[PDB]
RNA sequence: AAGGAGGUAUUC
RNA sequence: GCUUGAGUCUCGUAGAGGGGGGUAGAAUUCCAGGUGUAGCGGUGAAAUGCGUAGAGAUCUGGAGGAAUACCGGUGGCGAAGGCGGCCCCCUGGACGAAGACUGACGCUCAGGUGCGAAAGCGUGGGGAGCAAACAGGAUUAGAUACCCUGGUAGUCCACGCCGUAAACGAUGUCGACUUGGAGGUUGUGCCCUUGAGGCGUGGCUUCCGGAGCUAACGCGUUAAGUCGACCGCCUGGGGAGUAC
């Protein structure tokens, strides 16, 4: 199965929905028989430049082993959901199970 | 291209044993499988001339292998083209 | 007529001319002076001295507002581009920050064809 | 000289490490050439991709005067 | 009191009121009506602002300051204007996986739970019906001024044919319907537009109702019960 | 090239610091390059010529550290 | 733009 | 029959290779407002042009199209044309290490087929910037030009056609052999990695140079050297790559 690193930034006004979004997305991979290898909530962070007239976005990182179809559905959800200002999903050759420099 | 699992499956069918990866029948079957796979790709991407150039080498090379096989052992040539659903 | 004492001086330094505009932090213009309207034409309009006199006129047609601290933003590779900052400093203004704000496309629109003079 | 990454044998630059990348971007925010830094070419390309990915995520700024 | 802004942060604004005295103006205390305006846009560092002392922490040397009281709370303006049950029209600001945030007049964001948009459309058509910025009318179900949230509802604008169907057919009426689905456990029978009853195989006629009931057959079954949780009308012949 | 005027430093120092900052950014050179459109062949050709002359200078310099011109 | 230094340029 | 040429398989690596779809920031233009007022723009010098119906300048918001600063490199990939933001999907080739397998399956190629910059053509879209034609202002003895202000096709998208370039390394493809040096890039083995070290071994690539070759310039292990296989082309300049 392909390995994907998913970083998405949630609107700061919905910082209280971040647990819910994480649970929902996590289940939508685990149900498709994929794995979850890393879950990091970097939290509220200052943005380098304003995004949609905002600063201080909420950062969530996810490193995942899942098939291409479920990840495709996940990206479509990001587009439709207006709580995530930006998201990037990147393919990775192997899994990662170490703290990011942000957590450290 | 062809997956690591799909190559092993084809080698088993068309070879004397697991390690007979270079027999002409095995090579022709591998080329045929990739050629048949790629037709779906070119249905959606007509303008992919660079990739189609690699497709031609597979077609042309299968022709050369089949001609050699026909010359050297007609019986396997007849048997192989029937099994792989080929003309000539 | 009001009192601000903290404004921003935008210097537009083009090759042919030098426009100085003084404004508040919000971006509402208070006054403006240009080298071409300060008594200089053609070969003299695009000179560092002409920009200095333009800076003098703008600092003289704005002091009704009593500006005391100034922030300078330079835009463009003009001839003067510097005499304006010096002239502003000498006109009785405290210069807080200097910033280059020249616009640089990140490989966008196509520029005009080269001049074959 | 002294390519820093090859000294530690880093496999991939990992855009998330903002502390490292700040060394390789200038005050204005554009990337410093490998000629100045001393980085090897292979790591230089990885470094450029990492910085560009960080800019997209707004971990790093494109230019000094976004706002 | 009048004070000069010494430092601006995304969580609050520092206003020096007296020499050596800095009070913190929360960004939540900066504006009643738009909780989502960054301090960098309303006040600059060094601006002289009139701020009201809300709280003084002598022990921690911090003063909580209110710009809030110079402006007006739109929640009280909303509570005076809109009683419980008021119909408010508002623009869909954003669509989220759990519900729609609706901005009402006064800069208030109302939350509509997705469970109240339709009783019969699973998941996918409801998201395509509403585009960001569309104007939707909902009735104020509950205003929580303490948590600063308005729950809005669409359910009160419709009239459930299910509710009319159950009211029209009292318990014990024999109702005729066309079978839409046949399962090993029972048959799903549509009795009206959006009102479906369930006739169990043990009450359909034999271990399998498929031998007795085909998809599309009209079955006369007695309205024996309604499951208001699952919209399931338990039928018996 | 933002410049913050520190305390106790003269305005000449502030102007000097700003000038060096602009030079490091190389803004003026970029604007002069972008005044006119240079065809890709011209841009490609000009880059090649600089490399050729630069390499020749290094090798010629290398010979000078060896050949007895005295 | 003019003059001085270092290098192919920096480790510092 | 054989394994050394040519292939197949196992594990990795680097890459602007290709096609489809998203997205990001800067910038130009236009529009809607706020501030403000008499110039702006352009040139060797001017004028045409824009502007008191408020321009230019400055701030905020919006619309749209095109291209992707820095990295960037006689750096990389591709048969050539060519390919440069980031991300995903589909996909082609190349190289390396170790081992196994097939067993001459090879090289070249008239005709044939395909790909093939830019301009151009056809149908239908799109149109920010740029800009043949064209309009105007200048310069000039003249200026059907160079320079200035505008500006249509076109440049962009989809689908077809065209099939040509100083399409150039002005050097057909494939193989073997023949002294060296400095590098770049990408693998891999070993030694003390003492700390980016040292020593080998493959691929591609830039410069210098020996023998030799060359008319000379120069080429020089990536040959224009020594040879072998196959193919294309030349036969004084013009007429003419023109007529039929
Ligand atoms: Mg293949
Ligand atoms: Mg011009
Ligand atoms: Mg033009
Ligand atoms: Mg190559
Ligand atoms: Mg031919
Ligand atoms: Mg064309
Ligand atoms: Mg056309
Ligand atoms: Mg058309
Ligand atoms: Mg013109
Ligand atoms: Mg020709
Ligand atoms: Mg060419
Ligand atoms: Mg050439
Ligand atoms: Mg030729
Ligand atoms: Mg040589
Ligand atoms: Mg002809
Ligand atoms: Mg011709």
Curated annotation (Swiss-Prot), chain C:
Under PROSITE patterns, the record lists:
RIBOSOMAL_S11
**UniProt keyword list:** Methylation, Ribonucleoprotein, Ribosomal protein, RNA-binding, rRNA-binding
Gene Ontology cellular component terms for the protein in this record: cytoplasm; cytosol; cytosolic small ribosomal subunit
Q: Which GO terms describe its molecular function?
A: small ribosomal subunit rRNA binding; structural constituent of ribosome
- Top-rank taxon: Bacteria
Q: Name one GO biological process term.
A: translation
A Pfam family the protein falls into? Ribosomal_S11
Entry's InterPro entries?
A: Ribosomal_uS11, Ribosomal_uS11_bac-type, Ribosomal_uS11_CS, Ribosomal_uS11_sf
Sorted alphabetically, which SUPFAM superfamilies does this protein's record hold? Translational machinery components (SSF53137)
Record text on subunit structure and interactions: Part of the 30S ribosomal subunit. Interacts with proteins uS7 and bS18. Cross-links to IF-3. In stalled ribosomes contacts ribosome rescue factor SmrB.
Q: Kindly give any further remark recorded in the entry.
A: Has been predicted to contact the N-terminal domain of IF-3 based on footprint studies; exactly how IF-3 interacts with the 30S subunit is controversial.
The protein's role, per its UniProt record: Located on the platform of the 30S subunit, it bridges several disparate RNA helices of the 16S rRNA. Forms part of the Shine-Dalgarno cleft in the 70S ribosome.
What the record says about family reads: Belongs to the universal ribosomal protein uS11 family.
Kindly provide the name given to this protein in its UniProt entry: Small ribosomal subunit protein uS11
Q: Which organism is it from?
A: Escherichia coli (strain K12)
Gene giving rise to this polypeptide: rpsK
Curated annotation (Swiss-Prot), chain D:
Concerning Pfam families, the annotation shows:
Ribosomal_S18
Does the record's keyword annotation contain RNA-binding? yes
Q: Which PROSITE patterns match?
A: RIBOSOMAL_S18
Example of a GO biological process term: cytoplasmic translation
GO MF terms held by the record:
mRNA 5'-UTR binding; small ribosomal subunit rRNA binding; structural constituent of ribosome
**Sorted UniProt keywords:** Acetylation, Ribonucleoprotein, Ribosomal protein, RNA-binding, rRNA-binding
Q: Which GO terms describe its cellular component?
A: cytoplasm; cytosol; cytosolic small ribosomal subunit
Domain of life, per lineage: Bacteria
Q: How does it assemble?
A: Part of the 30S ribosomal subunit. Forms a tight heterodimer with protein bS6.
Q: Which HAMAP family match?
A: Ribosomal_bS18
Give the record's family classification: Belongs to the bacterial ribosomal protein bS18 family.
- Functional description taken from the UniProt entry: Binds as a heterodimer with protein bS6 to the central domain of the 16S rRNA, where it helps stabilize the platform of the 30S subunit.
Cross-referenced PANTHER family: 30S RIBOSOMAL PROTEIN S18, SMALL RIBOSOMAL SUBUNIT PROTEIN BS18M
Protein name listed in UniProt: Small ribosomal subunit protein bS18
Tell me the organism: Escherichia coli (strain K12)
- Gene this chain is encoded by: rpsR
Curated annotation (Swiss-Prot), chain E:
Q: Where in the cell is it found?
A: Cytoplasm
Residues bearing N6-acetyllysine? Answer: 84
- What does the record say about the knockout? Essential, it cannot be deleted. Upon depletion cell growth and total protein synthesis become linear.
Transmembrane residue ranges: none
Residues forming the S1 motif domain are 1-68, 85-155, 172-237
Post-translational modification (record): Phosphorylated; probably on a serine. (Microbial infection) ADP-ribosylated and RNAylated (about 30% of the modifications) by phage T4 ADP-ribosyltransferase ModB. This results in covalent RNA-S1 conjugates and allows the phage to reprogram the host's gene-expression system.
Induction and repression of expression: Represses its own translation via the N-terminus (at protein level).
State the domain notes: The 6 S1 motif domains are not equivalent; the first 2 no longer bind rRNA but instead are involved in protein-ribosome and protein-protein interactions. Binds to the 30S ribosomal subunit via its N-terminal fragment (190 residues, the first 2 S1 motifs) and allows translation by S1-free ribosomes. The same fragment represses its own translation. The first 3 S1 motifs do however bind to mRNA pseudoknots in the 5'-UTR of at least 1 mRNA (rpsO); deletion of S1 motifs 1-3 but not motifs 4-6 is not viable, although a deletion of motifs 4-6 grows slowly and is cold-sensitive.
Q: What family, per the record? A: Belongs to the bacterial ribosomal protein bS1 family.
Stated name of the protein: Small ribosomal subunit protein bS1
The lineage is:
Bacteria, Pseudomonadati, Pseudomonadota, Gammaproteobacteria, Enterobacterales
Query: Entire protein: which part is shown?
Result: 280 to 519 of 557
Swiss-Prot record, chain F:
Q: Name one GO molecular function term.
A: rRNA binding
Highest taxon above the source species:
Bacteria
Gene Ontology terms describing biological process: cytoplasmic translation; ribosomal small subunit assembly
Which residue ranges have biased composition labelled Basic and acidic residues? 59-70
Segments of skewed composition (Basic residues)? 45-58
Write down a Pfam family by its short name: Ribosomal_S21
Keyword line: Ribonucleoprotein, Ribosomal protein, RNA-binding, rRNA-binding
Subunit comment: Part of the 30S ribosomal subunit. In stalled ribosomes contacts ribosome rescue factor SmrB.
Identify its protein family.
Belongs to the bacterial ribosomal protein bS21 family.
Name of the protein in question? Small ribosomal subunit protein bS21
Q: What is the lineage of its organism?
A: Bacteria, Pseudomonadati, Pseudomonadota, Gammaproteobacteria, Enterobacterales
């Amino acid at each position: 199965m392909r390995h994907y690193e998913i970083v998405f930034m949630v609107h700061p006004d919905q910082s209280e929905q971040v647990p819910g979004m994480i649970e929902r997305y996590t289940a939508a991979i685990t149900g498709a028989e994929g794995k979850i290898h890393r879950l990091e909530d970097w939290g509220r962070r200052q943005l380098a430049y304003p995004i949609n007239k905002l600063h201080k976005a909420h950062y969530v990182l996810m490193n995942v082993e899942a098939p291409q179809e479920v990840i495709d559905e996940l990206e479509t959800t990001f587009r439709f959901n207006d709580a995530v200002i930006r998201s990037m999903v990147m393919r990775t050759k192997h899994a990662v199970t170490e703290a990011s420099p942000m957590v450290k | 291209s062809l997956s690591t699992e799909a190559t092993a499956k084809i080698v088993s069918e068309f070879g004397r044993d697991a390690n007979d990866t270079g027999s002409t029948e095995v090579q022709v079957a591998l080329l045929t499988a990739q050629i048949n796979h790629l037709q779906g790709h070119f249905a959606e991407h007509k303008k992919d001339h660079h990739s189609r150039r690699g497709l031609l080498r597979m077609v042309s090379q299968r022709r050369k292998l089949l001609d050699y096989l026909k010359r050297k052992d007609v019986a396997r040539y007849t048997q192989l083209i029937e099994r792989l659903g080929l003309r000539r | 007529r009001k009192q601000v004492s903290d404004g921003v001086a935008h210097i537009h330094a083009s090759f042919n001319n030098t426009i100085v505009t003084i404004t508040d932090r919000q971006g509402n213009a208070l006054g403006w002076a240009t080298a071409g309207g300060s008594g200089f034409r053609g070969s003299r309009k695009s000179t560092p001295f002409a920009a200095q006199v333009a800076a003098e006129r703008c600092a003289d047609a704005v002091k009704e507002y009593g500006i005391k601290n100034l922030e300078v933003m330079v835009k463009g590779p003009g001839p003067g581009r510097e005499s304006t900052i010096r002239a502003l400093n000498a006109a009785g203004f405290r210069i807080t920050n200097i910033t280059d704000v020249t616009p640089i496309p990140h490989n966008g629109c196509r520029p005009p064809k080269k001049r074959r003079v | 000289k002294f390519c820093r990454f090859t000294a530690e044998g880093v496999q991939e630059i990992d855009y998330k490490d903002i502390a490292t990348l700040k060394n390789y971007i200038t005050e204005s925010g554009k990337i410093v050439p490998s000629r100045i830094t001393g980085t090897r070419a292979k790591y230089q390309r990885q470094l450029a991709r990492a910085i560009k990915r960080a800019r997209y995520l707004s971990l790093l700024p494109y230019t000094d005067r976004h706002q | 009191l009048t004070g000069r802004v010494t430092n601006l942060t995304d969580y609050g604004c520092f206003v020096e009121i007296e020499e050596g005295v800095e009070g913190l103006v929360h960004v939540s205390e900066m504006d009643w009506t738009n909780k989502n305006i960054h301090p960098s846009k309303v006040v600059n560092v060094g601006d002289v602002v009139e701020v009201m002392v809300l709280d003084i922490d002598e022990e921690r040397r911090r003063i909580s300051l209110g710009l809030k009281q110079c402006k007006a709370n739109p929640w009280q303006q909303f509570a005076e204007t809109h009683n419980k049950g008021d119909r408010v029209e508002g623009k869909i600001k954003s669509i989220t996986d759990f519900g729609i945030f609706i901005g009402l007049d006064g800069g208030i964001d109302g939350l509509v739970h997705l469970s109240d948009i339709s009783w019969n459309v699973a998941g996918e058509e409801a998201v395509r019906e509403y585009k960001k910025g569309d104007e939707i009318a909902a009735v104020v179900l509950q205003v929580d001024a303490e948590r600063e949230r308005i729950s809005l509802g669409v359910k009160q604008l419709a009239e459930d044919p299910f509710n009319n169907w159950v009211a029209l057919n009292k318990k014990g009426a024999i109702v005729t319907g066309k079978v839409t689905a046949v399962d090993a456990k029972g048959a799903t029978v549509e009795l009206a537009d959006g009102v479906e009853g369930y006739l169990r195989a043990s009450e359909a006629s034999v271990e399998d109702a498929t031998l007795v009931l085909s998809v599309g057959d009209e079955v006369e079954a007695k309205f024996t019960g309604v499951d208001r949780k699952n919209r399931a009308i338990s039928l018996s012949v | 090239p933002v410049i913050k005027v520190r305390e106790n430093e003269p305005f000449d120092v502030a102007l000097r610091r700003f000038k060096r900052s602009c030079e490091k950014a190389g803004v003026l050179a970029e604007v002069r390059r972008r005044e006119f459109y240079e065809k890709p062949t011209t841009e490609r050709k000009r880059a090649k010529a600089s490399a050729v002359k630069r390499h020749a200078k290094k090798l010629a310099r290398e010979n000078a550290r060896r050949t007895r011109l005295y």
